[PDB]
């Protein structure tokens, strides 16, 4: 599924990501934009044979098959990705775990990603 910006912003809010571990909602929308272009089916293989899955491009090297205790297919649906991301952002480097978030979103006016919805 390709989410619309506002569609995804609403869904992430309903799944409890607003200020989760201190990260405002637009952070999460922004991270999805630059990770998957809002495509829940996005799959990209890493150099090392692992693959990044789903709307937030969660990496099978660590998180699924498995630190989120989930098959990676669970991350490719029109909840699992949110629950795993919540574990990831509690894990060690916060949202810096998503390099694209760090380079494109961190410390910007991320409220823009939810304005007009």
């Amino acid at each position: 599924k390709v989410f619309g910006r506002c569609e995804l912003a609403a869904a992430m809010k309903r799944h409890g990501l607003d200020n989760y571990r201190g990260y405002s909602l637009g952070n999460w929308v922004c991270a999805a934009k630059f990770e998957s272009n809002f495509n829940t089916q996005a799959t990209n293989r890493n150099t090392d044979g692992s693959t990044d899955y789903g709307i937030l491009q969660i990496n099978s090297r660590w998180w699924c098959n498995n630190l989120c205790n989930i098959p990676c297919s669970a991350l490719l649906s029109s909840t699992a990705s949110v629950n795993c991301a919540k574990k990831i952002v509690s894990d060690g480097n916060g949202m810096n775990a998503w390099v694209a978030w760090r380079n494109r979103c961190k410390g910007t006016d991320v409220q823009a990603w939810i304005r007009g919805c």
Partner: T-cell receptor, first 106, second 107 residues
Framework: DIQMTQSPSSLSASVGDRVTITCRAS??????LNWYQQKPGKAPKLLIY???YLQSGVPSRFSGSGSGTDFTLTISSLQPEDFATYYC?????????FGQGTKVEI | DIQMTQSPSSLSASVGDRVTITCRAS??????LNWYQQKPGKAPKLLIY???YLQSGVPSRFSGSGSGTDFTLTISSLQPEDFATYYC?????????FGQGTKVEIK
């Protein structure tokens, strides 16, 4: 840079009183505000961050409210150990910026 | 929370001296370090962000360097306006956290 406007500059109150400090931001900063307590000669110590999340060891008497451009730090039942300068600092955008502080005497 | 360890705690120096302050982080914080300057009775004033980027109006005598876990603020040719308390602060993770400060006082 984001400009933070903190009031008042100073206040004096009695033990057990409610005290209220305000912090206005020049633009929407969601809830990305730190509240610090600084005692003489020491670094600022974090009390509250984000959407009123209290640091470990901080009494429930401290609470933060607000979002967007309008934030409040309320100290319920002021106690003698609360003597300090309090500061707000936004970390929504780079660079982080401070309000001017509120000196609290008890 | 990330622990920031700042050294020295205090120092005394003369106009024209070089001052060197170190900040270490308990984990890798990439380049996300602020350096603040605080004068008596005033709020901390940001001098440097991203470990080495200078605020407009701050002279190039202030040099931020380092990365990862190891950072340095070097103040060259110390001037009268430079006597103050300096603090490093990481903003890599939430919450931000402060080093304990360095008081830079006149000889």
């Amino acid at each position: 840079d984001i400009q933070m406007t903190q009031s008042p500059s100073s206040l004096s109150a009695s033990v057990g009183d409610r005290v209220t400090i305000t912090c206005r931001a020049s633009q929407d900063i969601a809830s990305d505000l730190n509240w610090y307590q600084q005692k003489p000669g020491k670094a600022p110590k974090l009390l509250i961050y984000s959407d009123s999340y209290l640091q470990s060891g901080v009494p429930s008497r401290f609470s933060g409210s607000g979002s967007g451009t309008d934030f409040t730090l309320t100290i319920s039942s002021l106690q003698p150990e609360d003597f300090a300068t309090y500061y707000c600092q936004q970390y929504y955008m780079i660079p982080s910026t401070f309000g001017q502080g509120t000196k609290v005497e008890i | 929370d990330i622990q920031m360890t700042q050294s020295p705690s205090s120092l005394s120096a003369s106009v024209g001296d070089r001052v060197t302050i170190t900040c270490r982080a308990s984990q890798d914080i990439a380049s996300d370090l602020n350096w603040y300057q605080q004068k008596p009775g005033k709020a901390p004033k940001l001098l440097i962000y991203s470990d080495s980027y200078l605020q407009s109006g701050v002279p190039s005598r202030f040099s931020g360097s380092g990365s990862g876990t190891d950072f340095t603020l070097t103040i060259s040719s110390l001037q009268p306006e430079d006597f103050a308390t300096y603090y490093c602060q990481q903003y890599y993770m939430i919450p931000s956290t402060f080093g304990q400060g360095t008081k830079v006082e006149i000889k």
